RNA sequence: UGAGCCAAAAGUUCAGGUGAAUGAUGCCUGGCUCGAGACCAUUCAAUCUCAUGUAUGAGAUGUGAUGAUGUCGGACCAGGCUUCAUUCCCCUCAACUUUUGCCUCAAUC
């Protein structure tokens, strides 16, 4: 519309209020404000961030489906309801690059408001609806009133409005003035308000509703003596309140006195059925006998009503009226919901028209329950002809979808202006009449005519600008500027709301955050004692409550007069405790047990050398020792280029600082070594190497090429040989040149003999070699012996440690790599030395903060023991440069290091290496087996984190400090204890002894459950039930108990372990595997395993093994999730196995 | 050519931790709207005393209306905490299956 098309412009150059009803195409120019502002160029995309604020879900949904249409710019939406003030924080920034356009509920806007942004998340235009519903004391107001002030740069000038706004905010009728109130919200809005022009452009394609009066109910009640019994319904509920779920019961019996006063005992009828049904749900909803009483008391006395209301059993003809044509698109309201529901009953019983309703989303007293999802359902059905026709009735009068509506008759709904206006409003093209009902029973004639009369007038009067203010100057300041002043001008008042607001949302978090031992805590509670002073005033004191874990948070206010206000001051005294929480080579010869001598400029070092070092040879155990006898010694450079063509062709040719076998050097040898029919000689044979190279022990002159060489394997056929040289013949195509010749013992340099035996090599045929057999099996030894010198030298690094206690042997087994089982593993010395880093990370956390919450010192002793963090002060060490792949585990490497160190020295010298690299109660004392110094220290371990409305202590903090020294305590006394068991079978026996399950039967079998005091009825149930079980709290308990015994102990770690040793030691002794039979079965056959699925979301009714072979056998548990019942029935295919 | 074994990889079945998502919720809070109230603001109408030394002022008292606050019930609505069920993620773990790496065997080099 034109109109319209204006209101957009001014929209632009200005913040402007735009007056329609039933939107009329509104919406759609704010679309078009959306995408003007868009087009235009801007100096950041984001800057303009128009927005669109709704506070119900649903409408955000209806909005979010047009926005899709057009809104090209990427656009986001909250559905809102959902206790994640975090996720709406990161949401939001991540909205922000993602999405131009954003939409959220009022209420969530104000949590993104606490601890805004200086530009207050540069919003800059904005749209608001529903100001007319606002009030001071209204949510939004508050919210409008932080963007009416804006801190920097006129932040938000121009902001857009969707609050097209009926009338005025309320009590049009009250003042002789068209809009008093409006007048005090325009200052607060500080946008200007465009001129109604109702008929200018509006209404050309917008039909009028007429008024119709007509009468309040078809005929009239026929019960006057009923309406007595009524009375006597009334008494009977007195009786139930002087009696003292029975309040809400109570409230039903007034409902059907309301429903047969207004239209008779037959309605009533329907409501005590509906009321029936509803009494079943709720018997089943408590099982409480004195409600389940009550309830019982209710149904006997409205089963007595409903046989003479069945006996004796609304605006019939107006239904008839529209009746004709079939008409689908109706709409008609009702005073209260009870009388929406049983409408179709009623409908049913006498008129048979078929009649449907929609029920409040919110539910009272849950007669009957409405989705938010359901009530779009709902509105979603009103469009399909059919479920029109039926027509619906709604209180709420609130996200319906109706159009084309005729009849739009509201019944006893005078209560609010704006509502009345937008049911004229609803009504729509076809037919158009609004229904209004006078009752004869009350009189309900003059208030109305009063009101219409009034709206109609001021709506006329407001048509113009400033109208209030031009007609009345002092006296309309008086009654409405000086009674509602604009609010947050000065800075106390913001800050006082954001602190408020903020006070709600931390408390609420921190306590969720924290124990979660119950699903709800009552850690804040308010006591409220009257301080009434002489004066017509009276006062307030409001006392707060709050645990153990918040000392100073607890604060007593009197200063304000109400009692609301007083509260609201401890909750800004509570907001702001609650922000200071937030707050010339020397020869070397090795001698086995001619020696092989190396040449070393590094003198070799005694500590470091190992005096017997073992061969792994099958044939025999050779132990080796080196030693340098010279020091510095001097070799010729000439002999010194022989030696190493000597070596060269001694060790990379036979491969395919120097090494020389010293008999003296065998300087004519390695001359010889550099360098490099007949008749077979015993003597060149005698030790020499053939090469076609293979020791000859001897020849053999009885084995000749002459004599037949027999086929080993028949299974191929290939032909047998006549005569030696036949197979050479056959096999090399070479004929032995002479048939007696001797033929050369068969032999193996490589790592069986009866193979080599079988054939015999010609000497012929294979040169002889200077090289002694003895000499090249030492050769053949020389590099297992040069990898060893290589792990020496890097042994000698070790020994450069800034601080060793011994000689480092165990570092060098911890930096051979992990599985490759050469020698040793040092995965046993990791796990020791990953559970004494555990011990002192916990122990400095401890330190640093007395207070600090058991779950962040959780957090901090994860962060500090992290392997990643380990692995980059390897790097650092350079313990990855001893082809690193960077998934190495080199932060095992530093956790095998400290374990080591711990055997070395002690755990001081250990801390030092990490700075380095790293950086009733009687009764229970007895049995415990240890006495408390201090009564205090063993209350806090007795004391729980549930408590029965009395909290002493947090038994969090000990049990933080008793796991981390438990553990560490029970893994020395496993390694002290030379088990030598596999390593990975050691690290599941570790897991195993570290169980909060086994602290638990610890802690039924000393009673400590019995001395704790828990506040938790349920969680007592739960330990009495594991009682029965045994013929994860109560581990955490022990745990709590052990970091009191540590504090009383001085913090030390003997006396903590003395203390726990008896209780776990016949636990270790029994296997105890861990592996469990399902996964032992896996073990015998995986080739063909299959698992039973659980049946339902609950615990499968059988578990069966459907593994093949074993069979199918039946196990029984709680639940087969946790495969106990595949277990059982694992087992049972064991013994049938 | 097989068979075992020994390491790895890719899968698969687990004991577990680890988060996320979607449901089922549960709990709590704020306000809206309307009636009753009670007490404060103002004061007609009527009354009531004092003056001027007829006409009128001190003016009061107060019927009534409005404007606030504090209660008690109706009719509404939006958030915040929050848990289990299922799925998935990641990290170990008990394995298993195949290939490789790589010991054997002996034709066999």
Same mark, same amino acid.
């Given at each position: 519309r034109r109109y319209q098309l204006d209101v957009l412009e001014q929209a632009k150059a200005?913040?402007?209020?735009?007056?329609?009803?039933?939107?009329?195409?509104?919406?759609?120019?704010?679309?078009?404000?959306?995408? !003007?502002?868009?087009?235009?160029?801007?100096?950041?995309?984001?800057?303009?961030?128009?927005?669109?604020?709704?506070?119900? /879900?649903?409408?955000?949904?209806?909005?979010a489906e047009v926005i899709r249409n057009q809104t090209c710019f990427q656009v986001g939406?909250?559905?809102?309801?959902?206790?994640?003030?975090?996720?709406?924080?990161?949401?939001?920034?991540?909205?922000?690059?993602?999405?131009? =356009?954003? =939409?959220?509920?009022?209420? *969530?806007? @104000?949590?993104?408001?606490?601890? &805004?942004?200086? #530009?207050?998340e540069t919003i800059d235009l904005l749209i608001l609806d529903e100001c007319h519903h606002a009030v001071k004391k209204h949510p939004y107001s508050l919210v409008m009133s932080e963007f009416y002030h804006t801190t920097p740069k006129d932040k938000r000038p121009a902001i857009f409005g969707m609050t097209a706004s009926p009338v005025n905010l309320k009590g049009v009728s009250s003042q002789v003035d068209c809009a008093i109130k409006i007048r005090n919200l325009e200052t607060k809005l500080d946008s200007t308000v465009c001129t109604i022009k109702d008929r200018k452009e509006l209404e050309k394609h917008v039909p009028m509703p007429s008024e119709i009066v007509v009468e309040y109910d078809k005929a009239a009640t026929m019960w006057s003596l009923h309406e007595t019994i009524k009375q006597m319904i009334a008494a009977v509920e007195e009786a139930a309140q002087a009696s003292s779920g029975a309040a809400n019961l109570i409230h039903k019996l007034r409902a059907i006195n309301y429903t047969l006063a207004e239209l008779g005992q037959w309605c009533a009828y329907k409501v005590g059925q509906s009321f029936l049904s509803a009494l079943q749900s709720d018997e089943r909803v408590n099982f409480q006998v004195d409600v389940k009483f009550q309830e019982s008391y209710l149904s006997e006395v409205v089963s007595l009503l409903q046989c003479?209301?069945?006996?004796?059993?609304?605006?019939?003809?107006?239904?008839?009226?529209?009746?004709?044509?079939?008409?689908?698109?109706?709409?008609?309201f009702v005073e209260r919901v009870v009388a929406a529901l049983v409408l179709p009953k009623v409908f049913a019983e006498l008129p048979s028209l078929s009649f449907i309703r929609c029920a409040s989303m919110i539910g009272h007293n849950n007669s009957q329950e409405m989705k938010s999802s359901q009530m779009q359902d709902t509105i979603s059905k009103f469009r399909d002809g059919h479920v029109t026709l039926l027509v619906a009735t709604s209180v709420a009068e609130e996200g319906l979808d109706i159009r084309q509506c005729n009849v739009v008759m509201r019944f006893d709904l005078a209560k609010t202006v704006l509502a009345y206006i937008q049911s004229r409003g609803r009504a729509r093209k076809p037919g158009s009449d609004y229904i209004l009902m006078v009752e004869r029973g009350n009189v309900s004639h003059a208030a109305f005519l009063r009101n219409a009369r009034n709206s109609e007038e001021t709506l006329r009067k407001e048509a113009i600008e400033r109208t209030d203010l031009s007609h009345l100057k002092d006296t309309s300041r008086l009654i409405s500027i000086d009674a509602v002043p604009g609010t947050v001008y000065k800075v106390?008042?913001?800050?006082?709301? /954001?602190?408020?607001? &903020?006070?709600?949302?931390?408390?609420?978090?921190?306590?969720?955050?924290?124990?979660?031992?119950?699903?709800?805590?009552?850690?804040?509670?308010?006591?409220?004692?009257?301080?009434?002073?002489?004066?017509?005033?009276?006062?307030? &004191?409001? #006392? %707060?409550? %709050?645990?153990?874990?918040?000392?100073?948070? *607890?604060?007593?206010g009197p200063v304000c007069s109400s009692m609301r206000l007083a509260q609201q001051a401890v909750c800004l005294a509570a907001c702001k405790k609650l922000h200071e929480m937030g707050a010339e080579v020397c020869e070397s010869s090795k001698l086995f047990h001619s020696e092989f001598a190396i040449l070393f400029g590094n003198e070799l070092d005694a500590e470091v050398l190992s005096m017997s070092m073992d061969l792994y040879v099958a044939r025999a155990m050779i132990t080796k020792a080196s030693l340098a006898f010279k020091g510095s010694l001097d070799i010729t450079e000439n002999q010194l280029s022989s030696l190493k063509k000597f070596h060269v062709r001694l060790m990379s040719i036979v491969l395919d600082? @120097?090494?020389?076998?010293?008999?003296?050097?065998?300087?004519?040898? =390695?001359?010889?070594?550099?360098?490099?029919?007949?008749?077979?000689?015993?003597?060149? /044979?005698?030790?020499?190497?053939?090469?076609?190279?293979?020791?000859?022990? &001897?020849?053999?002159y009885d084995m000749s090429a002459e004599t037949s060489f027999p086929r080993k394997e028949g299974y191929l056929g290939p032909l047998e040989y006549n005569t030696y040289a036949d197979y050479y013949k056959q096999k090399y195509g070479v004929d032995l040149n002479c048939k007696q010749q001797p033929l050369i013992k068969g032999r193996g340099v490589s790592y069986v003999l009866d193979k080599t035996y079988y054939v015999f090599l010609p000497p012929e045929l294979?040169?002889?070699?200077?090289? !002694?057999?003895?000499?090249?099996?030492?050769?053949?030894?020389?590099?297992? *012996?040069? #990898?060893?010198?290589?792990?020496?030298?890097?042994?000698?690094?070790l020994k450069n440690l800034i601080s060793y206690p011994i000689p480092t042997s165990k570092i060098l087994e911890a930096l051979t790599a992990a599985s490759c089982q050469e020698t040793f593993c040092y995965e046993r010395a990791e796990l020791l030395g990953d559970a004494y880093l555990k011990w002192v990370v916990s122990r400095f956390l401890?330190?640093?903060?007395?207070?600090?919450?058991?779950?962040?010192?959780? #957090?901090?002793?994860?962060?500090? =023991?992290?392997?990643?963090?380990?692995?980059?002060?390897?790097?650092?060490?350079? @313990?990855q440069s001893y082809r690193v792949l960077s998934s190495k585990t080199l932060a095992d490497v530093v956790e095998a290091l400290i374990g080591v160190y711990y055997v070395e020295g002690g755990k001081i010298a250990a801390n030092h290496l990490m700075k380095w690299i790293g950086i009733d109660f009687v009764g229970l004392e007895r049995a415990l087996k240890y006495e408390f110094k201090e009564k205090g220290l063993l209350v806090e371990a007795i004391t729980h984190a549930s408590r029965p409305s009395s909290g002493v202590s947090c038994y969090q903090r000990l049990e933080f400090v008793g796991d981390a020294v438990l553990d560490h305590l029970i893994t020395r006394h496993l390694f002290f204890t030379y088990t030598s068991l596999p390593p990975g079978?050691?690290?599941?026996?570790?897991?195993?002894?570290?169980?909060?399950?086994?602290?638990?039967?610890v802690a039924v079998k000393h009673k400590l459950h019995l001395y704790l005091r828990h506040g938790s009825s349920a969680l007592e149930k739960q330990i009495r039930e594991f009682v029965k079980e045994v013929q994860k709290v109560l581990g955490d308990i022990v745990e709590s108990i052990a970091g009191a015994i540590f504090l009383d102990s001085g913090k030390d770690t003997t006396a903590a372990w003395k203390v726990f040793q008896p209780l776990l030691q016949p636990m270790v002794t029994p296997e105890t595997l861990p592996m469990h039979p399902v996964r032992e079965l896996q073990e015998r056959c995986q080739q063909q395993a299959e698992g039973l699925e659980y049946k339902a979301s609950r615990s499968g009714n059988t578990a069966t093994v459907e593994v093949f072979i074993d069979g199918v056998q039946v196990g029984v548990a709680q639940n087969p999730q946790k495969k106990m019942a595949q277990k059982l029935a694992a087992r049972n295919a064991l013994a049938a196995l």
């Amino acid at each position: 519309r034109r109109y319209q098309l204006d209101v957009l412009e001014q929209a632009k150059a200005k913040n402007t209020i735009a007056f329609l009803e039933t939107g009329a195409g509104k919406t759609l120019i704010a679309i078009l404000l959306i995408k !003007s502002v868009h087009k235009d160029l801007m100096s950041q995309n984001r800057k303009m961030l128009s927005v669109f604020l709704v506070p119900k /879900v649903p409408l955000v949904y209806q909005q979010a489906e047009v926005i899709r249409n057009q809104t090209c710019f990427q656009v986001g939406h909250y559905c809102g309801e959902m206790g994640q003030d975090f996720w709406d924080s990161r949401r939001w920034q991540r909205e922000f690059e993602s999405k131009q =356009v954003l =939409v959220m509920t009022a209420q *969530i806007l @104000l949590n993104i408001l606490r601890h &805004s942004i200086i #530009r207050m998340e540069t919003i800059d235009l904005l749209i608001l609806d529903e100001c007319h519903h606002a009030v001071k004391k209204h949510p939004y107001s508050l919210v409008m009133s932080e963007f009416y002030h804006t801190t920097p740069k006129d932040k938000r000038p121009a902001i857009f409005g969707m609050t097209a706004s009926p009338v005025n905010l309320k009590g049009v009728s009250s003042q002789v003035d068209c809009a008093i109130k409006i007048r005090n919200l325009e200052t607060k809005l500080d946008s200007t308000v465009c001129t109604i022009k109702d008929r200018k452009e509006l209404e050309k394609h917008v039909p009028m509703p007429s008024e119709i009066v007509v009468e309040y109910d078809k005929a009239a009640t026929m019960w006057s003596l009923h309406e007595t019994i009524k009375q006597m319904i009334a008494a009977v509920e007195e009786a139930a309140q002087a009696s003292s779920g029975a309040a809400n019961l109570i409230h039903k019996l007034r409902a059907i006195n309301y429903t047969l006063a207004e239209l008779g005992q037959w309605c009533a009828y329907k409501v005590g059925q509906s009321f029936l049904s509803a009494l079943q749900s709720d018997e089943r909803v408590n099982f409480q006998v004195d409600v389940k009483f009550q309830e019982s008391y209710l149904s006997e006395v409205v089963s007595l009503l409903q046989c003479e209301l069945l006996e004796g059993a609304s605006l019939i003809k107006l239904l008839l009226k529209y009746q004709h044509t079939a008409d689908f698109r109706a709409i008609v309201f009702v005073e209260r919901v009870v009388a929406a529901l049983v409408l179709p009953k009623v409908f049913a019983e006498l008129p048979s028209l078929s009649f449907i309703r929609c029920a409040s989303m919110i539910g009272h007293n849950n007669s009957q329950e409405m989705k938010s999802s359901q009530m779009q359902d709902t509105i979603s059905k009103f469009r399909d002809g059919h479920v029109t026709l039926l027509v619906a009735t709604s209180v709420a009068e609130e996200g319906l979808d109706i159009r084309q509506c005729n009849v739009v008759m509201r019944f006893d709904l005078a209560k609010t202006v704006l509502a009345y206006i937008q049911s004229r409003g609803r009504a729509r093209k076809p037919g158009s009449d609004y229904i209004l009902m006078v009752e004869r029973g009350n009189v309900s004639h003059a208030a109305f005519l009063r009101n219409a009369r009034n709206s109609e007038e001021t709506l006329r009067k407001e048509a113009i600008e400033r109208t209030d203010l031009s007609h009345l100057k002092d006296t309309s300041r008086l009654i409405s500027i000086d009674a509602v002043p604009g609010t947050v001008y000065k800075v106390e008042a913001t800050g006082a709301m /954001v602190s408020l607001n &903020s006070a709600v949302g931390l408390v609420h978090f921190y306590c969720s955050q924290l124990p979660g031992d119950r699903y709800a805590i009552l850690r804040p509670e308010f006591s409220m004692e009257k301080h009434e002073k002489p004066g017509g005033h009276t006062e307030y &004191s409001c #006392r %707060l409550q %709050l645990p153990c874990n918040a000392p100073f948070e *607890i604060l007593e206010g009197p200063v304000c007069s109400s009692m609301r206000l007083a509260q609201q001051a401890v909750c800004l005294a509570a907001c702001k405790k609650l922000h200071e929480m937030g707050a010339e080579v020397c020869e070397s010869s090795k001698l086995f047990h001619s020696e092989f001598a190396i040449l070393f400029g590094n003198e070799l070092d005694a500590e470091v050398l190992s005096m017997s070092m073992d061969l792994y040879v099958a044939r025999a155990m050779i132990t080796k020792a080196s030693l340098a006898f010279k020091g510095s010694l001097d070799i010729t450079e000439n002999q010194l280029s022989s030696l190493k063509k000597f070596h060269v062709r001694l060790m990379s040719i036979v491969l395919d600082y @120097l090494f020389v076998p010293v008999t003296g050097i065998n300087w004519e040898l =390695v001359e010889k070594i550099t360098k490099t029919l007949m008749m077979a000689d015993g003597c060149m /044979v005698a030790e020499d190497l053939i090469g076609k190279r293979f020791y000859v022990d &001897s020849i053999c002159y009885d084995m000749s090429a002459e004599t037949s060489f027999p086929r080993k394997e028949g299974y191929l056929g290939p032909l047998e040989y006549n005569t030696y040289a036949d197979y050479y013949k056959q096999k090399y195509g070479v004929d032995l040149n002479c048939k007696q010749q001797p033929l050369i013992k068969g032999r193996g340099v490589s790592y069986v003999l009866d193979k080599t035996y079988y054939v015999f090599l010609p000497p012929e045929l294979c040169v002889v070699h200077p090289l !002694s057999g003895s000499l090249i099996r030492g050769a053949q030894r020389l590099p297992s *012996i040069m #990898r060893r010198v290589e792990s020496m030298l890097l042994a000698v690094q070790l020994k450069n440690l800034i601080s060793y206690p011994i000689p480092t042997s165990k570092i060098l087994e911890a930096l051979t790599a992990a599985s490759c089982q050469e020698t040793f593993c040092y995965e046993r010395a990791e796990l020791l030395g990953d559970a004494y880093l555990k011990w002192v990370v916990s122990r400095f956390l401890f330190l640093k903060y007395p207070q600090k919450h058991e779950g962040q010192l959780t #957090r901090m002793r994860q962060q500090m =023991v992290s392997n990643m963090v380990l692995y980059q002060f390897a790097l650092v060490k350079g @313990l990855q440069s001893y082809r690193v792949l960077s998934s190495k585990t080199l932060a095992d490497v530093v956790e095998a290091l400290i374990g080591v160190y711990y055997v070395e020295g002690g755990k001081i010298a250990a801390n030092h290496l990490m700075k380095w690299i790293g950086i009733d109660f009687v009764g229970l004392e007895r049995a415990l087996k240890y006495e408390f110094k201090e009564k205090g220290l063993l209350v806090e371990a007795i004391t729980h984190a549930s408590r029965p409305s009395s909290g002493v202590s947090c038994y969090q903090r000990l049990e933080f400090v008793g796991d981390a020294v438990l553990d560490h305590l029970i893994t020395r006394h496993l390694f002290f204890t030379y088990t030598s068991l596999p390593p990975g079978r050691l690290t599941d026996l570790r897991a195993a002894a570290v169980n909060n399950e086994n602290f638990a039967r610890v802690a039924v079998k000393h009673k400590l459950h019995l001395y704790l005091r828990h506040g938790s009825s349920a969680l007592e149930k739960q330990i009495r039930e594991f009682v029965k079980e045994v013929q994860k709290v109560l581990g955490d308990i022990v745990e709590s108990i052990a970091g009191a015994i540590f504090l009383d102990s001085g913090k030390d770690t003997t006396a903590a372990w003395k203390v726990f040793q008896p209780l776990l030691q016949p636990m270790v002794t029994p296997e105890t595997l861990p592996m469990h039979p399902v996964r032992e079965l896996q073990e015998r056959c995986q080739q063909q395993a299959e698992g039973l699925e659980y049946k339902a979301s609950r615990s499968g009714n059988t578990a069966t093994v459907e593994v093949f072979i074993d069979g199918v056998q039946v196990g029984v548990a709680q639940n087969p999730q946790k495969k106990m019942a595949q277990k059982l029935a694992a087992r049972n295919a064991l013994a049938a196995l």
